[PDB]
Design a protein around this ligand. Structure first.
Ligand SMILES: [Zn+2]
Ligand SMILES: [Zn+2]
Length: 218
């Protein structure tokens, strides 16, 4: 099941029951993924979108479909594709969770500041939905974190994991290429039984995406 907006720039795909993947296209047409979690107590998103226009539209779209409000959003790192609509979240009473590092880099990049509440390992529970945020170390960026849904064994790798047809690591000006490999290793050592892994850009895959990325980093 895929729900799209009129322009075709924003789509929502269902991984299963309460887990959907949201994708938006930014102009430069670059796609970026995040998650939408339908819980008994509001909608929880993993990352926003490129800017406030797309983010506001993404939000008013999932709130319309699920007839609930987006209560929280987990920002995986301080780049436009993840923290682009931080302003939109803050004026709608939506909590923008992030590590302290992500929060400071956000301000350094001219974005409004998120909560900076996530520690290296943080477990959040929204209704019956369980979420785990993990900072594996420096990789795509210095602050990048991954998200893990223990009930589905779904891992949101974010820009730290490349899709299967991506042969380019992407922007490495802010990246730590040498440490990237160790950081993926920490994710692999931490989560032994992964089912699906969502890349920052691209189709949902499996742990083979982490191996693929380690290959690109060699
Ligand atoms: Zn990025
Ligand atoms: Zn990226």
């Amino acid at each position: 099941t895929v729900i799209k907006n009129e322009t075709g720039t924003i789509s929502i795909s269902q991984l299963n029951k309460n887990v959907w993947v949201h994708t938006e296209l930014g102009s430069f047409a670059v796609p970026s993924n995040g998650l939408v979690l339908n819980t008994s107590k509001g909608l929880v998103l993993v990352d926003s979108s490129w800017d406030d226009k797309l983010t506001k539209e993404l939000i008013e779209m999932v709130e319309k479909k699920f007839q609930k409000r987006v209560t929280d959003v987990i920002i995986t790192h301080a780049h436009a594709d993840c923290i682009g609509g931080i302003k939109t979240l803050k004026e709608r009473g939506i909590k923008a969770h992030s590590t302290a590092l992500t929060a400071e880099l956000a301000k350094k990049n001219g974005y409004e500041e998120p909560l900076g509440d996530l520690q290296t390992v943080t477990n959040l529970k929204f209704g019956n939905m369980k979420v785990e945020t993990f900072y594996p170390g420096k990789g795509h960026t210095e602050d990048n974190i991954v998200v893990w849904l223990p009930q589905y064994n779904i891992l949101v790798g974010g820009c730290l994991v490349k899709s299967t047809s991506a042969k380019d690591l992407g922007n490495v000006a802010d990246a730590y290429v040498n440490e990237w490999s160790t950081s993926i290793e920490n994710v692999l050592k931490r989560y032994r039984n992964i089912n699906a892994v969502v890349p920052g850009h691209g189709e949902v895959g499996d742990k083979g995406l982490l191996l693929h990325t380690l290959d690109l980093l060699k």
